[model samples]
Target: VTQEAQTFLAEFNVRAEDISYENSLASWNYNTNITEETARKMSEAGAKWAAFYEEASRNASRFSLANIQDAVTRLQIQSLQDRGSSVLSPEKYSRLNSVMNSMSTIYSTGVVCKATEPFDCLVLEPGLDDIMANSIDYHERLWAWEGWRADVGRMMRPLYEEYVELKNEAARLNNYSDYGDYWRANYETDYPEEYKYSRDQLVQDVEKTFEQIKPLYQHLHAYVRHRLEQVYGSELINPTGCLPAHLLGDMWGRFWTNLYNLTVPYPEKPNIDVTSAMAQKNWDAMKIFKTAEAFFASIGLYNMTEGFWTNSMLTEPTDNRKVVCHPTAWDMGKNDYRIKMCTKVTMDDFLTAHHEMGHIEYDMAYSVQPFLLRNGANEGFHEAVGEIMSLSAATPQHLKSLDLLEPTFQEDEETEINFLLKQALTIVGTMPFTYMLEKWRWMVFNGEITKQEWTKRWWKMKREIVGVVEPVPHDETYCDPAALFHVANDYSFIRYYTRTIYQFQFQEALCKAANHTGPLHKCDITNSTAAGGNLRQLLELGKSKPWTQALESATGEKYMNATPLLHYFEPLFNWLQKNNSGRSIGWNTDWTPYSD
Candidate 1:
């Protein structure tokens, strides 16, 4: 790694020299000819100052990377603060929440660019100028959208029932003891059954409610289509591009179709597995996060993926552009476009390696960004972009790099239908999980939960909505808790689900542009990534407009929908049943079926 970094150092310094050389030459471009005396002085001064700027730039960037790593590492485990779930002092949690929220917005939007292309830029005429502000509207509407569905499904209603019962028990216990610990003890233990029952029942209720609305699933897709067409009327009114408006614009629809969109399609596998593992003594999920983290670290992970702005690393008149080097990082100022990868690789390292490469790809794609905006438009977009293009690496053109052709998924009608159905259900399976996690956080902020309370909450929901077969993480039967198995607490898993949905949307549009049957499953990173330049233009526009405009222009879909997700899950579940598969997609099958 040091050797690689050393090699990078040489290249980076070269880039610094080039920039300085260019800036000085830029002056010459304006002046056709320079007097010999003047040119000599100009060349000398430029070299002198450029060297200073180069050194200063490297030092400053090094400091920024060091500080970012330090800060993230410190806060990363702060949530586990002394003897509680709501650890990290309330104010600290609030501050962290703000960071998470900001990170979420930029990360999400950045992924959009990672997924699509120059078209992403073309949509800039009507995209976000201020993402954080714009994020609120989309999130607010999303929350409202989910809230309305929850109310109709009577999901949260059961929570109200549990709250009433728990509060009453707490009141009764308080009357006897008049102590804070006494109240917490009673709520955490004595009155826990009602809470457990309610949570469990709510999960059942939600599943049953979804089943009842099975017929309405199609309508959800239709409504998304209607809204999308109306909102993106400028881009998709006639939609002369190659794909169908319905097939192209609806990411939800496309993902659903890929897995669950057709008469019987399947959905993609969800990234999160809330109940697959058991809860742990502490809610640490580093082990589960290892596969991904190791993937990057192995590929030379460091230098802060997106924290330049926080360090005042913006391009000001007083600034010089130098490359930063670190224990685990390469210089970024000059060689941001290049990715040094191992020549020898294996299949296990494939997914994550490509994902990191995806990030480097975007970093290079928009090296044009001012330091402040280099991170991304929002967290979702940022994450989605990396994830989406990695999918490209799985394409036909990319397979040659691995010395393997893209495998075909040819099947008989029944098998093809079954396969597609499972593909589509992934979106459906994940939405509620994200919703539940967010709701859990909301409750924590509202002072309604302590950390331990989450165990029972998982116990209830894990069994009901998703269906656990064996003992979960805490389940003595398995001896390993799933909660402790994954990166649940760190909040990275949520992006997978969120980004998966976004990827499908991008795929829907890309397939249209390419006039292909669906997103080319073959991993063709170079072409697909170049195609993602459309997304770069979008992010470069930088919080200047609404996402709907950029989304419509990119994918041809106006609104997001739930139907695609639902369609995905149903078929996938059915397939899992028929196959009796060991891997529960990404889920575990230890959960016991509902007795009632």
Candidate 2:
């Protein structure tokens, strides 16, 4: 950086120190009358300058190999010490930890959150035109907001190419091994660690969980097929491929697959490697399903614990604990066990919110671990629990509670069976597109394709695999110039697609275990009466074990399988016609609100 940049950076550091002092004072005073506006502004400024220092440090590293004398590095360390240490709130710490953890994870394994989501598509049956429209639009809108304008890519591509050429030239002019060794020795913190595979054993356990859940998929699909013929006056059919938005736009199509997508299957083993097996599983389970589960894990539980232990900083009786959910708390690192409910009104939001709450609920039931171990057995294991909760919520019984359906909705046994079947299909329909997006992202980053070309490929894949299509005019707000997640600043958002697969199986087992003929909204109080806190017990055990062990504990089973997801589609397509009287035809159901 230039001397001018250096001076500005110094000024930023001083400002940061001042801000930190104020923060400490606010904490000491218990924040009475301390407005959050100043804190938020200061936090934003701190993050911006911290990012700036990271950039400067990287630029400075190029000047010398023998020594690490970069102004940016110095600034980064200073910022970390200044701002990070001063912010004593859980939310602030969580944010800081997230930045470090996400960066460290990306640098180490190239496997961002829930990397296993992409692989789950291998087993789903396609057929979704309705659900794609609603869900995919948000997916795309958020994607576009991440700034993947075609022009931006075009502008950056040449710079990257130049960088490649420069690297090659530098290697040719200097000794490559010496250059490599010295760089590694000198600038270790700036670069990501080489990716490796240490979590293979854990994945093997997850695969076993999938194996145990196969028959459940078949049963669920059969139910959906039966319902579709009865309700829609059509034969059950699965699409070949689909776009999230396209399916979301079509209410019938998206609802058709809701059940299947409610829980991700073990068949799609998460990319939780050795180094990240624990955190990866927790991160995926929490991000993908936390809202639906409503198992309130106080935010920053991850920071205090090594795993799913009660000692997580969350359980600590620190003075900072009082700052929950406040805006200033976010700056001071205060966050709550809030769920990911979006402002949009749609069935997707309904189901996703419930599913995410399922995860949080699990945390609530089992806050028994230490700060070092505050979570469940594994992603699939925890997800299995959450998915069951989501499916339960999606039922007419549960729908009544959310005001999505009436108490008398689908009162007949046959109709309820059909309803359960349809729920299963919703999940079945989500996997392929989820996988397709991930595959598309890999292709884009690997230089195999362009954004427009990828869009065409998505449509083509949809027709061939998902068996549905309703092309919306490209709105820059919802369409990406590149792959959606890639263009947007999210990684592994695709896992939601995969997690839906597992929800189907989790739903089936719970229904049968409860001896219920169809999906029920509430837990079996009977089980609680018979085996006090059976539901809570199941959640607690699952929370503490590894995923494989947890599944066994929950269901006396081994793993998830794709068959359950595939089995529910046909019956689900039929039920919509009979029951979807007030529902909109396409995905954008915001036009028609469901009443309580």
Candidate 3:
């Protein structure tokens, strides 16, 4: 009877939900406070989860389950098959979580104390940004950057090695060649035909997209380097070499928006920096989040759940206890949705709250989805939703509406170029950063980079791919990649890359739905319910369709494209081409940040 499939679906959903709840609760506990007890509880939670997988594998393998005719039920079956049993024994799975927890704990709780001012220390969140963005002292920036890697990443190195071995073994046991391949598999979409999908195909798509955007990236880079050379002088910042990592306006150099004042096209124009405006209004983290909530509500999206209000760590704890300050969003099964950030009073945090809430809203939109289907159409779609909000929030129109920008702020050609330049630094600048981070991981998992050569290869890739150089002295013992919260915490990174690609498509499509005029950059979808309606249709997909179909669902496009991204950045591209007249367009391939 058809009831058999229905019965299995009901039973599996309940079990999956329960297991996810417990695991999520356990993770929240340990992540919020990295105590030995909570760590033990998290390991216990990991151990508890293997049974569900074991049971799922058995059911998924049964011949009767394979041909289930019901469309939704078949999806559940496919989900079960893909997420099969614990390839490692329960004990090893527990050990793996123990190692994973330890690495992230080291990352979260670690602090870098200045060598001269030993009592003065900073954690990753609000502190690191302050140093990397505000401090013009090149020595101070280099010290903080290197100190963070030494303090946090060095400690995680051995733990990372063990994590690699365990996760790689897990993947191999599950029939993947390595852990990276296992991750890439998540991006593979099902189709009626076979040739359209493969893990290798994803590699090609990302590389191709990156290539399309590289010329524009190099132009922006060349212009930024010229500006920095005038600030830091030729000795510290080479005119022809890759950018100094510590000077790129963020700890990771992933975003350069903070360098806007230095790189702005027209300093004569009024500044768009909202930090002082936010402080003038006495905006706390609550206001930041509440404002973000209102933005979603204004467009007819889900309001923050009561649980989100009660449990989220929107601000850094004052209890003197160490916590992971990296910003993230969580869905703890049921209605438990929360965000974790050591939020500060800054424009970045303001936009970040909007970005983080995108994850929460996506979770809420898909809350009614079956346990297995309660996910992004792909991981990238979830990111795009949050990013689309940031793109809107970053607009002068939206900022002016919020009183963050002056009501009289004009949208002339120069201000538009300035605005686009800022967006390029944040969005376009991050594309290569995202690509190189994951590519290094994939290389590591593929055994192309040995543990002894990890740091060497990482910095080389930084110079080569990202056009940034690690000037601080470091050795193989430090896992600089793990300095990033996602790398230490083991999250998929290509989602960020795909997120960048998809958000522009999402923005253009949603802008059209909003019926906006003029440049795509200027269209703010804040109050557009039609745009909200279109986005809601996309967010509610919940993995029921292939991401390709979801892309078509949202944009009527079958594949991801950089055209919108290029179109959005067109103004900056043209300006940079004209302004970067005397600068070299590319870096020396064999350039090293070190001298013998």
Candidate 4:
């Protein structure tokens, strides 16, 4: 009887594994091509796969550990959760899954561009970054920014509301306090009890760091406001509220720090523009992609496949199809890794390729694990791995090494401070945008904030947590959050914020493993097989074990700590404090310290 039971279980596991792969492959195709047939097939496959797994998981407790000797059997059993029976029915699951599929398709296929001749061309992925980086004309920048948001707001808001309602209903039926709680519960799983935190506790933990950095954010905002006033004059600048959107350097007020160059020009550095150097060499998008791939290979990680080069949607097609311009990394199960991007030749895209390739490398590393285990320690860890490499590439020394710039004295205090300030703007400065978007979502999901109050409270939190306000007035009817595809597509935003904190810690550990003795910011693990090995160890573990274990494997620490981040930004913080000592730290006078 024992032998028969083992054979049956083994067969069941094989079938389940096959179904999982088929489901993922179909989903990947749907995301890439996005046809009605593909969408329907993806949805049907997912619905069937979920039904099978849920049913199998229901009887998970009946299987004996002694009988589960193989790796597949063990993983199959462990994949089953003790979270009780499903309260969401098959019909609701199908509906919710269908909504997500449809939204993601819409998000991928949407585009905004001028319809005029010589530029009937769609503005590709690098187009916005290029405009934001190079354009000095406020109206032109404003036109591009609004063009990007207009379609997302008009086409996606209704679908997004439907998605939220369906998702919230499912969560409620599943006995979660709300959809936010449900989403976060999944994130905190496969971890030790101590590492796991309730959604509220997690928010508190993130907010603690937010508080630590709030002063610096205030300093940057004030400095930028003053600088813009000088550039555009005080007549154009908004007083006592947010700066104009174009002046801040992004469509959303997120990452206004990128505008540091326009406002606070570096002290006349020689040929510091990395983009011009790349252009001089006629470096196209593919070369840029391969450059990042080479960086990974130099560090002892796996190089991308020829299939990836051929299969990916790396550039916008000339055939006049409206495609999603945002870059994405996809793992189509069974070692099939691809990046879908409308890539262009720009410094921003160069760095973005490195970041996206981070996802690619991780996907390859964990591909050997069982289907259930092929994920990062968490979403944050996945995001951090790519950024870890990108940060190294961004270092001035690394740029010099690539002959992209002339070598400069590392000991020059001004140069060091300037470099650190740039890093702060890109990484540390943008943390709260990610943190607060999801924080607001969680509040909405929990019914702590009603839909009627959505837009009003969103602005309030942005002012409080992110230290930016709406450039214009908004209300509940506007659905401001839907401007982001993640909100509509149901992706987690908190992971990006978490990745920002964890990447520095990860870099610090890699630096230590490489036996470097320099300041934390100067550590580069490029070509260090030791650091590469450590990363591979963490990646291979995937989500099979608790995230604490994975983090420990990489950093020798079980908890996510902000010390490394603070250490990395130490010089920048000191400089900002000295320069902007008199600036106030909150949006309004009555803003209280954040709690809960």
Candidate 5:
């Protein structure tokens, strides 16, 4: 069993390395359509590899308990069970593979956001949503937002639905009740009894956290509601309900941090406009990207190598066919990391560069692990690691330390409120929306909901979980979920949801480790190699052990908790309660607009 497992693992690693190299190039050179054939070939190779693994998994699952003699064999068996979906029959595997390949093509092809007026239409770029969020004009913002979703609903719906069906079938073949169950099982565990992780428990945990944090969300949403009334008219939004989607200042209404400028004006401090700062310094993409790299380096973590700058698709190409506009990080092989983004020098993109680079650094840290283990403890760890720095990046204190802000900038009660509000909207505010995206999908996959009710139920969950409602009336025809790349591509939504919680916990842990006695929000790990070294310990663990072990290594806790998150936002919660006193806290569904 030892010899067999070692050889099998080696063979699997070789295949994965080859496919990773090919897919990396394909995604990097996507606009040329130069590597399209290569990517498809790699996809087929990947499917073949999965088929082989599935056969192995079947044998492993049936192996007698007495036959498992050693740790390697035991781990191999446990790993196979964890990766149970691969045990699907060949025909089902092929169908799922084919659906995914087609989805890849569909995703690489860009979405065309066409407004009613040609002038209003703009080619939707990666950072274009940031532009839409910042726009002051309501009709223009509406055109862009609606056009964005219209493209996805009209062009991608049929394919997305078909993919979901194929995935559900694959899940069934693996003996899971549904795709959601199958996906959740991989992330969760009941083993070792002492520190078990369960999906239902995590969901319940997040919901509880959501309830605790609901006042903050309601306060922020209510403030936005009031501002939207002032901007458009009181009748534009319900008096005590979700803000208009356009006015939320995000394409998905998940991150309204950008609206901080309008909603809560900085008290007597010139808004530290990072974009203008970048322009004033004449910073290019590499320069800006490096600043983020420097932040990690200052903390004694890995920085982007020369190879990355040379190889990554950091900016738009001189000539273009079509390429996916979403930013992504790729780890083709050790020390061969790359980031593919149509990057611009906006503040949003600057922060995004940091986020993507976070993934790259994680790849760097764990590149030494066995191929299968070369991932974060789980998907959320990757996101949370990068976000740890991002929290610091957005902090005024951190900005001032980097000399990006005026030296005169200081935190008062109002300044603290402003900073926390921005953080809440962007980070804390994102929890429920991210959670509900997968929650909705899981429900659909489990047959608890029907396709006919997808959009209807999505809105309902959005209202209940995220305090959001559609800006316009929608019918079954709209494929609202398809608008986001993750939904269209079938990535697990729970990774994002978990990361929101993980980041705060991880941040708090890092602060304590660094011996910072300040507010949790102000603990910048910059120049603290101790903090960097501590994070690397978790990253280096990769997936060699269970996620609980990884969490324990980094945070000294074996289970995920929201106490850190709540504590981090305690000040902001206090401010919101005071400011939102006597304000209605729930949505008004019966309210309607008054005709001019």
Candidate 6:
């Protein structure tokens, strides 16, 4: 309530921004060029920032916030306490940074190779992900999938244990019971009295949302299981049981969109695999990004900055420098926003470019806000903003406009099912999987799950919730969760699930703004400045308002509702019920990935 609070916040913003830029630059360097020195540099930058935040956060507690006139200033004051993961001692904070950086280095450079022929190795990008996407061979996909676990996930167990302890200690330091609760605190803000939120409330809301989408996920799961049975037979995939985890068209089954080519319900209908068309048009990685840029431009969003073109790592370097090729967009402070992805020449990459660039567009939109407010209303909102863009970009009408599909390509009932099925595979397929992983992490961090039972509990939840079973058995030493980049890099997974619902809500509202008449699935918001206006209004608010208020500006929804997503997939759900007449509607997979 005094000049001291404003003085502290203003001074802290400059220091925080500087530290973030230094840390982000170091991280970008380490990710793009993995080395002992680079990892050490990243650790050093993080360690310095950690120590600084821990000291400043301790100092921030002296503020008398009961009479603070500006709630926005009060919001920033409270956020400093939750800013960086910090422990009681400087040594523990430094060691935590070192361990985190070292683990990521191992993850970025991990390769699966033959035991006898170690030289015949394959990295996650061209080797494992390629096999997962293109190979119909269950054996090959299983080899890559299982190999990745043993090589990468299993090796991170000790570090993961250390991470749990380090993060838990930091949580305690920050007045939370554990890191899971600390992560949950990011969602709750008490700025507006009516919008007051809590960590436990978020947990309840997630369970409710999951239940809302469960029937749709089940229908999609059953249909995919029946279709997959025809391809892999009854042995590897049970006729009325869970899917073999490796065959879900990705290493983690996070996105089943790749299964479209093999599991299309109507093969005679126009194929949605526009990668062939992209090849014919000679579209490369850079063009894919440019095309994504044009899509946003048409919607009245800011174009990519000049620095974005000169600085971004759009394609894998041909000069043989190691880089973590996981698709990510970085906000490097000020107006310097860049995307780091090893983009491929495929329709998947094209859509993904839009998703990642959506992150950049968000950064551009929020740059005018205060320093602390320069972020998504919540993590989920940031994630969904780009996805809403991708939803429109994938439409056949949009594809035809870009000449990625034939001009004669027309919509029909069958193609509608095919399109919805593909969209379901990409969106709905990962919900239970995401839900299960996050639930497990929450349980692990909160002492509800034992340390010895991490892997056992993980697979048990995976089979029961996701109905996807690992091809091979695992144990406590494996640390299957670390196989995921988000897990290793320490990000909360629930945002993806939240965004799943929000994207549909935004799409429905935006499509209506664009004056679309037909199915929500077919509506494209390209060149629709009205739709853009609704979205930009939300983005520009940043974290200044509660997420509910921010959400209403974009979608006219005050709370996260699964209704829009359910509505969008209603047609597909009805068709699934009709087509899945002979097969059972649910899985009976009771097997665990853990050995007794």
lDDT of 3 by residue, 1-596 (tens): 24676787778788878897899999888878878999899878976786677777667656353467765777677667654226688788878888987987888787888656547878876787688988788988987888898888889888999999999998888678889999988677754333245787888889998999999999999999999988889788778889878898888898888898788888898657789999889889999999999999877787898899889988998667768787999988867998999999988889899999988998988777788889998878888888889889878889989888888878888888877888788888889999999999999999999988999999889989989887866888899999988899988899988988899999999999999887888878887898888888878878877778778878988677988899888888988898988889888655545753
lDDT of 4 by residue, 1-596 (tens): 34544555566557777787788767766766656888799878887787777776665656664556554445445555322224456676667667667777765665666756565434425566577766667766766665655665556656667777777776776567678877776455432445554556667878887777666667766666666766777556543455555556765656766577765535575324788888897788888888788889877888889868887888876545455566888876655677888888777788889999999889888877766667786778888988888788877667777777766535466767777767676776678777888889988877787767877887787776665645445545566676666787687788888888889879999889889787787777777889889988888877776677678778987766877888887777777677666654345523222210
Comparing 1 and 4 on TM-score, the stronger one: 4
In model 6, where is the ten-residue run with the lowest total lDDT? 587-596
Residues 179-219, candidate 2, lDDT per residue (tens digit)? 12212211122221231112332234334534443334333
lDDT of 4: 0.71
Q: What are the per-model C-alpha RMSD values against the true structure?
A: 24.0, 16.9, 3.6, 5.5, 3.9, 3.0
Clashing pairs in 3: none
Poorest lDDT segment (10 consecutive residues) of candidate 3? 188-197
lDDT of 4 at 45: 89
The sequence of per-residue lDDT tens digits that candidate 1 reaches over residues 1-596 is 33333333445445544665454443332232334655576557565645555453433333322233322222211111112212234454445445334433322332112124453321111232222113323333233222222222122223333332343333333232211232222112111122222222323433443454333332333332333344445243221111121222122111333323322323342321222221321222222222333333322332334432132111111213222111111224443332322211333234444555456544554455433234443344555665664455444344443334324423333544443343334444344444344334334433465445644554454334333221112221210111221211123233444455566566545544545453244223243433444555554533222344455566665333333333324444454344433212222223221211
Question: What TM-score would each prediction reach against the true structure?
Answer: 0.39, 0.43, 0.87, 0.80, 0.85, 0.90
Model 1, C-alpha of 490: deviation from truth (Å): 4.9
lDDT of 1: 0.35
Q: How big is the positional error of residue 346 in model 2, measured in Å on the Cα after superposition?
A: 9.6
lDDT of 4 at 133: 65
Q: What does the lDDT read for residue 59 in candidate 6?
A: 69
Encode model 5's per-residue lDDT on 1-596: one tens digit a residue: 55665665566567656655655555455533445675576556555656555665665566543455554345545665544435556576667666666665554554554435664334555544755668777776776667667765556666667777877776787667788887877566454445678867766775676676666667767766766676778656677766656667777777777777677735565454878877787878888698899988988987778888888878876554555556888786745887878888887788888888988888888787776667777777888887887777777767777677778876777777776777787776677778788888888888887988888888888777776767667677777887766777778887777787889889988888889897898778788888888888888877766788778878888777778888888888777677667667677643323212
Residue 70 error, candidate 1, Å: 33
- Among all windows of 10 consecutive residues in model 1, the one with the lowest summed lDDT is 476-485
Between which residue pairs do clashes occur in model 5? none
lDDT of each: 0.35, 0.37, 0.84, 0.71, 0.72, 0.85
Output the TM-score of candidate 1.
Answer: 0.39
Which wins on lDDT, candidate 4 or candidate 6? 6
Please identify model 2 stretches exceeding 4 Å from their true place: 1-357, 379-384, 397-426, 442-464, 467-487, 517-538, 541-544, 566-570, 573-596
